[PDB]
Design a binder for this molecule. Structure first.
Ligand SMILES: Cc1ncc(COP(=O)(O)O)c(/C=N/[C@@H](CCCNC(=N)N)C(=O)O)c1O
Ligand SMILES: Cc1ncc(COP(=O)(O)O)c(/C=N/[C@@H](CCCNC(=N)N)C(=O)O)c1O
Lengths: 512, 512
């Protein structure tokens, strides 16, 4: 209509036209409820689950009860600049878990924040502290090399070689200082994988491939180079083209030369163990070895974003441990809030950790007492009974993956693949840009196909699926570890129904 | 030398300042620590989450509403579904702003997880607006270049060679396109006030004056120019130096000239109504009028950061309404989570709001059901009983300000001023860098004075104060609206004690 609206007009307009215009009024385990026209609750199976936030489902009774107990105990939520031992206690548990799963006896400092993106930006900031340490060291050495060369050229023990000048003593040194100062002030680069998703704040958005989400904001912040994960022979040459030089004077016996030395341009490499923005593709061993090489070569940290793959989703606590990704920094977020509060953590290896970070970084809401308590509960639950929860994820993941595989095998004309691991899975949809049906074709063309297919699943089978990937070309399946055999069977029926409709090009049934 | 997993440096530093205490419980204006015998010691909290706790710690009505929302099975994670509570919150905030400003302006709401995230939504939207202006300018320049190319080939006009020092028809146009393309890719500027605090993420940190917090990160993101608030005759010339030009061809009858046109460099102006990082200084009417002039002149939005001054702190809902600051965008955070959860909102004027922002911006945890419910409760509480809560803040503020003034008047040798409004107040400490006492002098020299004085207040009067401002040169007083007459008297006694010890240069009593 034409009445005043104060939020979400465009978002709601667009959700309605996709068939996703529903208000969920209540949620319990793997079920969200909307009201029909008569005001009765209609149960919907949730495969989205806060984009993998709800490993234990919606409003887990043990988490709700813990939260209520912490509220009634008068938990100190706001205790800024006082002792909060729970931060140390959480970091200790995460350290013990990482040692168990990797067999490495490595120690990590924890910095807390309020979202996945804030945790990735603590890592970007710390990576840049490390880069400024390397730069200070390099520039101190260059000053000493310049002083030494200036001794040998004035004293008279050496001659300037004029073949090097395409890069008078005092004038050449001032031209070097100018060149070097320009280089020093240039923005660094981050390296990501193609399809990368690392958040949407001013810094983190540059690390997210999705072109409409990022390219309006290019001018604001340091960019990333999106390395091709599938073609990792081309990564070496792409990173090689980003080499940059500072100048110094090199004294060898009686000849002084202007020479190029390497400048640290790359602040950090980011990687998701399972690539959310890419349709849940797992990092292959070949790509892991290439990211290890780049980290060893450039001397910048490798940051492992486990915002989505952490707290058990993959069948281990850390998906990095499962896939052999050997990171310097790790980030966690989604499941650590128990599906009720907001919390995130950067783990930074203690032998790289710059203690200035503990006093120059802060946030009003970070390390709050309520999300600290709930974190310790979530970690108790995921660790309980000698790690049977991870075994439950692996066994539920296998059941759900096998079902999605059984559907692909009979629907390979519209389903190109199953991707992911544990309970972080996706179907890849074949391109429908040449679809017989105009309505399907137009939606594929605008990048809206997955959204439309999700509407079908909602209105005809009462199943909530959300798409992933850049043109909604993937369907996400990230339910809780309590997903039942009967819910997996109902999803199978729904998907055969959906993919039979798609084979038949039934635009009247699929598109509203 | 035992294994530590967080906060070693932060805790070491708090201990040496006299602030090494663990709060075990909190209620109203009181936090509790345990003495050596295990008894709870009540401490009066003047810090209150840096102005998060207008209603105090764990307000029974907020705790009860939170428990009710959890027991109702509120949907916390309902991403890409209808969430009418966002619209309902934005509507209440719109109604309140109309009442306090008399302006019938409408605002769209985008939610986030922290004060910094809300400021970065504003930075991102400001940059969308700047990219619209740029597209418009570049379209006009293409048309001007086509018209000038007609008149120079057709033969109706002559190129004036006096204008060529800004760069043959085709070659001059290619030199213009190159110049313009370089300009287009340059990072924008933000304008802030000196002492500004707008958060500490990759983008927002550039908007925060405090040099140790910001300067390590300079290379990452667009900078700000910190305008001098006190001397606003110099603002004009500082913004004037940041003028940048693109080139075009100007056809005037039969002469074509290369000319400079204005390029939109400034993405946004940020302002706090009460300047947190400046020791709680209120924006004066002269400075307000200068920020209005800059916004009208540059055509970028004025973003009013009410993360700290919002939700009633100043004796109105919006401190911008109280001080006559006419913003385009507003941010809120601290008190809106009820002292228990994390939430923030950007209000953007609907006649500037670019609907792409509703579908290209998102966050996992933003607009969650729990903080949405608690927001509506906090807004009900602050609006209740025909605005008597604002009256209570004004009346509590006057009582606390009068007390701080009565202390300054008798302790003007060590207290230089009282700043702020409502329940957002501070004492300015006189410089102690020339202090008789070595231990006081050394602490003043490291910028640690306010922290040390806060330790005295904790161990001797059981009062929690934290410093503000860049060299901890201010003491913050931002308690809840329930602060009692007796708590204000106990603070007076504590401060006379502290400032008599400081007058006497009693370093053995003040510094551990
Ligand atoms: C691997 C990774 N790193 C960072 C973040 C950011 O953390 P934050 O959101 O700030 O808490 C996330 C979130 N992943 C979900 C997010 C939903 C955002 N909205 C839409 N995608 N529509 C996803 O890929 O869809 C992440 O997965
Ligand atoms: C006006 C304004 N804009 C943004 C933020 C950041 O919002 P966020 O912290 O990200 O939620 C704040 C916080 N202001 C307080 C406390 C900061 C929290 N602790 C430190 N980081 N210092 C201050 O002046 O000390 C703000 O006041």
């Amino acid at each position: 209509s034409g009445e005043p609206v104060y939020a979400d007009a465009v978002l709601n307009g667009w959700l309605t036209s996709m068939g996703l215009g529903v208000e969920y009024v209540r949620a319990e385990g793997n079920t969200v409820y909307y009201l029909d026209d008569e005001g009765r609750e209609v149960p919907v199976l949730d495969h989205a689950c806060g984009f993998g936030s709800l490993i234990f489902g919606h409003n887990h009774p043990e988490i709700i009860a813990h939260a209520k107990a912490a509220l009634d105990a008068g938990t100190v939520v706001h205790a800024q600049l006082s002792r909060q031992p729970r931060a140390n206690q959480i970091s200790r548990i995460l350290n013990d878990i990482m040692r168990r799963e990797t067999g490495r006896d490595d120690r990590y400092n924890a910095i807390f924040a309020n979202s996945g993106a804030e945790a990735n930006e603590i890592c970007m900031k710390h990576a840049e502290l490390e880069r400024q340490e390397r730069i200070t060291a390099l520039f101190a050495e260059i000053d000493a090399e310049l002083d030494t060369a200036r001794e040998a050229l004035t004293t008279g023990t050496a001659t300037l070689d004029t073949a090097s000048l395409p890069l008078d003593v005092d004038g050449v040194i001032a031209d070097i200082h100018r060149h070097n100062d320009e280089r020093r002030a240039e923005r660094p680069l981050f390296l990501t994988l193609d399809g990368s998703f690392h958040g949407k704040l001013v810094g983190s958005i540059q690390l997210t491939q999705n072109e409409p989400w990022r390219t309006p904001f290019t001018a604001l912040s340091s960019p990333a180079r999106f390395l091709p994960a599938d073609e990792p022979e081309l990564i070496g040459k792409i990173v090689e083209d980003e080499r940059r030089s500072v100048l110094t004077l090199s004294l060898d016996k009686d000849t002084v030369r202007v020479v190029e030395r390497d400048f640290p341009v790359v602040a950090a490499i980011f990687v998701e163990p399972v690539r959310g923005g890419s349709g849940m593709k797992t990092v292959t061993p070949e790509l892991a070895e290439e990211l290890h090489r780049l980290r060893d070569t450039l001397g910048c940290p490798l940051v492992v974003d486990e915002v989505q793959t952490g707290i058990g989703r993959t069948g281990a606590f850390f998906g990095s441990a499962l896939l052999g990704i050997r990171g310097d920094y790790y980030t966690l977020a989604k499941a650590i809030g128990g599906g009720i509060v907001k919390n995130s953590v950067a783990l930074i290896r203690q032998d790289r950790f710059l203690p200035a970070m503990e006093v120059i970084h802060s946030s009003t809401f970070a390390k709050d007492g309520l999300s600290a308590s709930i974190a310790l509960k979530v970690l108790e639950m995921v660790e309980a009974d000698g790690g049977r929860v991870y075994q439950r994820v692996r066994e539920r993941g296998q059941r759900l993956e096998a079902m999605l595989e059984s559907v692909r095998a009979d629907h390979s004309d519209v389903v190109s693949a199953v991707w992911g691991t544990g309970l972080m899975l996706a179907l890849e949809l074949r391109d429908q840009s040449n679809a017989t049906s105009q309505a399907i074709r137009e939606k594929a063309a605008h990048g809206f196909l997955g959204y439309v297919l999700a509407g079908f699943l909602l209105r005809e089978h009462h199943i909530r699926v959300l798409p992933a990937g850049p043109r909604s070309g993937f369907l996400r399946f990230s339910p809780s570890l309590y997903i039942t055999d009967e819910e997996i069977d109902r999803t199978e029926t729904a998907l055969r129904s959906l993919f039979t409709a798609l084979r038949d090009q039934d635009g009247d049934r699929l598109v509203l």
